[PDB]
């Protein structure tokens, strides 16, 4: 209750601040993030799916565990943050940008990814909003599947187009959902993956892959 309600309140407050910032800077996006960086310089983006609980800042540390158990204000929270892989850049995007988040089943963080394993849900939520200092983007979902940690869906960059094409085709092959989105080697992708606590018994992960489109 003290954790829960307070945590929830703080997210509501930040969500509201970001919606105000968006409405204020109608064309731009850099001022919105410069403002959010005052709270935490590690806030690199924002992810939002309308009608769902996915409406969070995106953190990035030096490692993939910096924000595993820490929130946007660097406070200890079991559910931590939605965070980007430490290897990824935002100025000039890598071929595959990876975001991680908890899935504890209380309809928060990346609990939503589990819903994408259903065709009906996918059809009603094909586009996810992603914003950063460099632009406003759409995440055009094309693949959703459950895997293990024995499978590398985490690949950030490729040796050539053939390697990248292999990856894209494998991604579509693994998909539990049918999509009309066309993804080529000239495109950049975003991987959304569930993230478990350190040294957890659970090896299963839910992965949602999307094509990045710049809307700004």
């Amino acid at each position: 209750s003290m954790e829960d309600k307070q945590e929830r309140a703080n997210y509501e407050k930040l969500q509201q601040k970001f919606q105000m910032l968006m409405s204020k800077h109608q064309e731009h996006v850099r001022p919105q993030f410069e403002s959010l960086e005052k709270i935490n310089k590690d806030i690199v983006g924002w992810i939002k799916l309308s009608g769902t609980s996915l409406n969070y800042p995106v953190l990035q540390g030096k490692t993939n565990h910096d924000y595993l158990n820490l929130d946007f204000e660097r406070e200890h929270r079991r559910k931590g943050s939605i965070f980007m892989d430490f290897r990824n850049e935002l100025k000039n995007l890598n071929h595959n940008t990876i975001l991680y988040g908890h899935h504890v089943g209380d309809n928060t963080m990346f609990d939503v990814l589990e819903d994408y394993l259903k065709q009906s849900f996918y059809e009603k939520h094909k586009i996810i909003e992603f914003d950063n200092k460099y632009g406003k983007y759409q995440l055009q979902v094309f693949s959703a599947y459950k895997t293990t940690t024995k499978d590398n869906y985490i690949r950030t960059d490729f040796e050539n187009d053939q390697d990248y094409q292999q990856f894209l085709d494998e991604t579509k092959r693994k998909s539990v959902i049918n999509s009309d989105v066309n993804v080529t080697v000239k495109d950049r992708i975003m991987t959304l993956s569930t993230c478990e606590d350190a040294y957890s018994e659970t090896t299963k992960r839910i992965v949602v892959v999307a094509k990045i489109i710049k809307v700004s």
Partner: peptide
């Protein structure tokens, strides 16, 4: 494998 990194932390996922």
């Amino acid at each position: 494998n990194p932390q996922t």
